[PDB]
Design a protein around this ligand. Sequence first.
Ligand code: HEM
Ligand code: HEM
Lengths: 137, 137
Amino acid sequence: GFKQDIATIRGDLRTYAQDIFLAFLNKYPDERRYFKNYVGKSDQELKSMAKFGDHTEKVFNLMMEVADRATDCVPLASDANTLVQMKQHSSLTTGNFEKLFVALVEYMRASGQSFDSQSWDRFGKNLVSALSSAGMK
Amino acid sequence: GFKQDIATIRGDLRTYAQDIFLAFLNKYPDERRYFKNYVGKSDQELKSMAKFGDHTEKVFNLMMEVADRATDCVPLASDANTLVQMKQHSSLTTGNFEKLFVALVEYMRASGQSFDSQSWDRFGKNLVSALSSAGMK
Ligand code: HEM
Ligand code: HEM
């Protein structure tokens, strides 16, 4: 289930983080405009960029912490607040998070692992609800 | 589902509030001690008493508002705080609440009306967690 999936991802975090984020950026290539130096590169060229692996692992480290503190796929409001008030997220709206979770759920359903992809879908929708409550447009 | 159940209960709130509260007291008779004015009265005698119907509906009105504001049966931290810090709930521990929800779920499963009882069980478990957090021993 959801709680086990957190353990699975954490068990090979940088691999899952890069693969899921790549799924996101491939599904929604115009999302790369929020990042620097990601456009014009294949998957193997992003993976050999140092910043890409490091940053993307930090993103999923935090995502897993937010998932782990949730109850029944409902994140803490303090965690939503953090994600809204991060300088690095100042250009974002909740739609950017919706796209991320659509791609993440799609990746899980295509994978060879026994993920609880409906729970990740509930978590994404609940996180978008919480980001809205915390004042993200 | 759970939202429909809130609608069902609200539609005939005096009736459900009184029936569920009496199911609670009749399953856990020792709990009647907290309601000094209800000692020594049958189900049918309590209903003729103004503050019985009026305070029991207020109890269940608040329960429904907490239920309605919940996400995926997880109540708001602020609503848990309200229930802990009511003068009327000063002596209570979380076990009192756990007994109420055991009785409420039993009532739902016994009824002719079609309730999402495992969701109420979950809600109760999540409310007890939140109450503890908010300082109820
Ligand atoms: C729950 C979802 C998300 C979590 C937990 C999250 C977490 C993070 C963390 C921890 C950083 C800092 C990375 C570092 O400094 O190394 C970061 C930076 C950033 N995030 Fe997110 N993020 C999430 C969703 C998004 C989405 C959906 C977008 C855009 C589509 C986004 C855009 C950015 C940008 C532009 C930066 C700064 C640029 C960069 O690190 O290269 N975030 N986020
Ligand atoms: C989610 C669960 C509950 C909610 C929403 C709730 C709500 C309330 C509300 C709104 C009142 C004020 C009634 C009024 O004065 O009109 C009240 C009073 C009271 N409650 Fe609770 N209650 C809950 C659970 C419990 C439990 C589990 C106990 C004890 C086992 C308890 C014991 C009392 C007592 C002794 C009073 C004072 C009697 C009265 O005011 O009529 N309640 N409750």
